[PDB]
């Protein structure tokens, strides 16, 4: 039973992001994708039970997938795509993890922002990984190995 996990996700994620910096002609998006905003002070938030807090994340997360598919959606068999691919796979494991935990699938929700920038999704992932994730599964937090 691992916490190998979040620690491992993060970096696996960042590795993805890096590999993008150098694909062929890399450019924005036709259509804005919505990814889960970059909330900033987790005040009101870490006061609240470990359950709602989890839902939000599974909430955001499912949205994150949607954004990301939304973005694979958009383009052809290209290198970002093929990566948004491997990313989306990644995002997927959390999704499990959190579905696993609350033992239901919630629908996408919580405040997002529109991003043409294909990084701002790689980003968005890591932001919950570093924030709302870590900040969850510290404090007791029966999270998912």
């Amino acid at each position: 039973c691992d916490l190998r996990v979040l620690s491992k996700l993060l970096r696996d994620s960042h590795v993805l992001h890096s590999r993008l910096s150098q694909c062929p002609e890399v450019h924005p998006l036709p259509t804005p994708v919505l990814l889960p905003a970059v909330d900033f002070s987790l005040g009101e938030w870490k006061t609240q039970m470990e359950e709602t807090k989890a839902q939000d994340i599974l909430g955001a997360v499912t949205l994150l997938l949607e954004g990301v598919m939304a973005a694979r959606g958009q383009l052809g068999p290209t290198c970002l795509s093929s990566l948004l691919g491997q990313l989306s796979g990644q995002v997927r494991l959390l999704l499990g993890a959190l579905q696993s935990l609350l033992g239901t699938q919630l629908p996408p929700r919580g405040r997002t922002t529109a991003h043409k920038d294909p990084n701002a999704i790689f980003l968005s992932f890591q932001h919950l990984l570093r924030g709302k994730v870590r900040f969850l599964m510290l404090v007791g937090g029966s999270t998912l190995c």
Partner: antibody
């Protein structure tokens, strides 16, 4: 955009078998946990089985009433969930909804009647 | 195998009047979930997580409850709202619904 058409519904004489099919489109099917949820006017609204994504490794779950007789299965690969009703029963009768995310989308149901 | 018992079995409400429905869990749960259903039709997810309207739902529906007695409120009743409202508890397995509650509009 997200579309569930169950099919397969029928007259079954008691003791008889039936398979319900439920075909999804509109979404990442592979990603969704699925449920069969069945409705009658006497019984009413009573959940039937649940069947988790590959991510949560297809973990299966039935109502005690149905434990041992119905067999839920999917093919993530055909974007469809199934109910292989078995050893049926005049109560097993009613509208069978194949269902969404954790209950978030909902096909229109087949009528299914076991009866002599 | 928690038992959800939705308060009024059928009620009637006047256009623009306050509708308030109860559901009540045989044993404390994290969250209620509500679906609206309408004769002829599949049911649809109306609120989830005790109080988030599912995309689709008018902002007149206020989702509420906590622990063991929960409740769905229509601010000022419309005629679309006439339908049954089923609560469901995803507390464990089996999932579990309720009676239902037939709202009727009263023209």
């Amino acid at each position: 955009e997200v579309k569930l058409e169950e099919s397969g519904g029928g007259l079954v004489q008691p003791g008889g078998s039936m398979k319900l099919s439920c075909a999804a489109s509109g979404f990442t099917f592979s990603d969704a946990w699925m449920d069969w949820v069945r409705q009658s006017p006497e019984k009413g609204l009573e959940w039937v089985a649940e069947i988790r994504s590959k991510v949560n490794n297809h973990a299966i779950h039935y109502a005690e009433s149905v434990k041992g007789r119905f067999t839920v299965s999917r093919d993530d690969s055909k974007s469809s969930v199934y109910l292989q009703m078995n050893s049926l029963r005049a109560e097993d009768t009613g509208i069978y909804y194949c269902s969404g995310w954790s209950f978030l989308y909902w096909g229109q149901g087949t009528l299914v009647t076991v009866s002599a | 195998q928690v038992v959800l018992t939705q308060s009024p079995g059928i009620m009637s409400a006047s256009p623009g009047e306050k509708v308030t429905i109860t559901c009540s869990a045989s044993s404390s749960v994290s969250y209620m979930y509500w679906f609206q259903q309408k004769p002829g039709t599949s049911p649809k997810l109306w609120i989830y997580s005790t109080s988030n309207l599912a995309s689709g739902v008018p902002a007149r529906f206020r989702g509420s409850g906590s622990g063991t007695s929960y409740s769905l409120t229509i601010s000022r009743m419309e005629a679309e709202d006439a339908a049954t409202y089923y609560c469901q508890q995803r507390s464990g397995y089996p999932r579990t619904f309720g009676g239902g509650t037939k709202l009727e509009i009263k023209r």
